Curated annotation (Swiss-Prot), chain B:
GO BP: any one term: bile acid catabolic process
The organism of origin for this protein: Escherichia coli (strain K12)
Signal peptide range: none
Protein name per UniProt: 7alpha-hydroxysteroid dehydrogenase
Keyword NAD included in the entry's annotation: yes
Source organism, top-level taxon: Bacteria
Binding sites annotated in the UniProt record for NAD(+): I20, D39, I40, D65, I66, N92, Y156, K160, I189, L190, T191
Subunit structure: Homotetramer.
UniProtKB/Swiss-Prot annotation, chain C:
Site (Transition state stabilizer) location in chain: S137
Binding site for NAD(+): I20, D39, I40, D65, I66, N92, Y146, K150, I179, L180, T181
Gene that this sequence comes from: hdhA
EC number: 1.1.1.159
Summary of subunit composition and partner proteins: Homotetramer.
Name under which the protein is recorded: 7alpha-hydroxysteroid dehydrogenase
Enzyme class: oxidoreductase
Active site, renumbered: Y146
pH dependence (record): Optimum pH is 8.5. The enzyme is stable between pH 8 and 9.
Length: 244, 251, 239, 252
């Protein structure tokens, strides 16, 4: 029930684990006893999160990967099985995302689909056979993060969400749970470089649920959903965004 | 491993006599919560309090019809008096199910009394009590009938869809008081009650569109309730988590 | 053309003495329906009958308090006396937007519509089909009562459609946004108004004509395979 | 008469050769619109242009492979040239269907080239032309798969859920230009295509969970398209109307 939120013996791939929400998923899962492949677009960023995990206990390995190359996604899977022996957990991060004008070049609209939909659907194809071997596992996508100037990322987030619901049918036969988190009003790095003394005091006037949560808030929900404690939770999208 | 423990924190669990609310009252108790156990039947409440004290936690029993506003005021008053405060409220008391379109209006209204009017009133009574100790967390057990459509479900589905939506609204309002509000839509739970009923032929039929192909246990739903009412869901509010192995189970 | 006409058909219409009800009443009369015009206030209902009669007869007035089951029932008996059959039912919630208070939203949006549907379906079954329509309340200030009631009523439609479908009766709902002429003046001001225009892509508020149009579509043979739909008429807004 | 006709309007209709998209162009042309009929086969759009012509309506054929951004740019400019304005865009062309989870990635990406990127680039093109007429309406034909939940449906369902959510995003971005954006999720339509495989026994399997016990006609969708693109929907934006008797119709 509190050992249900542990992952000892489990092996996890986390994409976009260099920084932000990905990073705390990787640290939270390692610290919960899982062997973890830390994957980012950026080799250096990957190795920094691994130093942080290794200096906490917990097994971790860095792998650079561009998630918009299939050859690269296969490399990650083949790497994961090479360093870990099996795969029980895939956590897939898109990356913040954020606003975009209607008249954006098509590439800029297509890019969101790689990050949030395509990469996620292919990595899920790469890891399902491994999971099935081991009598099951769990796949989890963290979608991008209020309705104007959002066609690319709101659109790609809704695709990924109904992809979760359907994947759960396809992969439930293999006893693989599929779910997603929609992260919300997160105090991210962006919003740190950009907050002045005068606003940190103005915000403290509001109640904790009316402010911003931390990436550890997404990380805690990710853990629960990928844990024995949620063994009958599938096709869910949990929005983790406080209450205004 | 401490943000999935409720040490100190004081919970009111309604309908905690049997099935889901019993299992939530016990999991909460064993995770450190002091637990007021409410049921329509004093006798069923006492069996669960006894059980929580054999296992080393602290629970008080309190008979309560959630359709009497005065009985709901007395339930809250009892919680403040034996625990000293309220941190958690698990709204499990509910009811109704398949009814024909031509039922009496009395029968249609009972659905709203059980699932809507009761829920809102108890939330509005405990809220001021939760602000004064710096906030709190409200959980309701809703139903998959709130998001599914079928013949003979007018009273039940509509009442539960209202409840599902009170979660979203209340989450906004009670945000100012630092209160979280969520719901759990449970799948088919293989409870003690059902385990009498269920032949191994019905099992096949219920799970025939359930991707994680087994029936639910009360523990599955109590695990979900533990997560949502714990500091690890401090950034989770206005949400309905469905636990049903990714499908629906007909009967 | 006449696939969006109501010639020879007989509509019951509540909340019809002002605002969205009145505009549906007149649209429907104009479309050829005989109309029972019910409002809480018998004066208001009576002016809408006389205005419909000046335009091209076939309207009848019936004071109804929709929160009392006897009043609901007399309006259903009164409606069968004057019209002979019922083909179309349009329930119009009496909710502006902003416990016994909490319950009133459920009387208007939920318990009135269901019970009126219960009285009127036996008549619709008898004549081999029909159509029922709810206008939900225009319903963040004291709207938790109206948003919950609106959500109930909306899923009532989705479910109630299965029940009445066997009887060849289609069920739908319109969930209207911020809509003027009617006594919204009450609280609108110039500040609260402009706060609605910034989150409405189509920069204008609704007229009652916006709903009555949708209402005519959903209640005509043009929408004869539409059931269990809530149509949002919000100029692009979100709820 | 007044609020539900298209006299003086100029429609581009994609996938217009058969089924739902053919009956949208015929009902639109009858409502008084000028109509650019587009299918992937110029012969298809033409047959339909002849059906329209033989009923009093001005129409024109411009073929388009919606998957190519250049034939998309060719269709846009043809309709500008032929009609003068673009007041209305009915997005109907698109494919995909059930495929297994272990599908080639090329099959998965194609569903997006068919059901999303097409819908969006073509909107990117007609939106400015619509702006300088004082507004317009865009309609897309989505799918109940965008809401429904089943096996072997990943490429189709996800992709259709993008098109459907696009609808409420484009409503916000184009409302400034006074453009309305809507969609319809059609039930099982007894098009000629379907009437040629239908058994008076699979009808029964499909009507099972279906409150108004009949399959649709392309007229049911065309009627709906006409409301949503007529000025009787002048204040309807960011909405999906599902037309399917209040049920889901399954081969399952």
């Amino acid at each position: 029930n509190s050992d249900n939120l542990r992952l000892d013996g489990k092996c996890a791939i986390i994409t976009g684990a260099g920084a932000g929400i990905g990073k705390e998923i990787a640290i939270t899962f390692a610290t919960a006893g899982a062997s973890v492949v830390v994957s980012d677009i950026n080799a250096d960023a990957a190795n920094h999160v691994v130093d942080e995990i290794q200096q906490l206990g917990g097994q971790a390995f860095a792998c650079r990967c561009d998630i918009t190359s299939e050859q690269e996604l296969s490399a990650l899977a083949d790497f994961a099985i090479s360093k870990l022996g099996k795969v029980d957990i895939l956590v897939n991060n898109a990356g913040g995302g954020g606003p975009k004008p209607f008249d954006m070049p098509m590439a800029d609209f297509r890019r969101a689909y790689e990050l949030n939909v395509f990469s996620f659907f292919h990595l899920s194809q790469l890891v399902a056979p491994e999971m099935e071997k081991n009598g099951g596992g769990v796949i989890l996508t963290i979608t991008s993060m209020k309705n104007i100037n959002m066609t690319s990322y709101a659109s790609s987030k809704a695709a990924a969400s109904h992809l979760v619901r359907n994947m759960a049918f396809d992969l439930g036969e293999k006893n693989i749970r599929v779910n997603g988190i929609a992260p919300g009003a997160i105090l991210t790095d962006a919003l740190k470089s950009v907050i002045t003394p005068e606003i940190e005091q103005k915000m403290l006037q509001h109640t904790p649920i009316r402010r911003l949560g931390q990436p550890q808030d997404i990380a805690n929900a990710a853990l629960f959903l990928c844990s024995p404690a949620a063994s009958w939770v599938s096709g869910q999208i949990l929005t983790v965004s406080g209450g205004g």
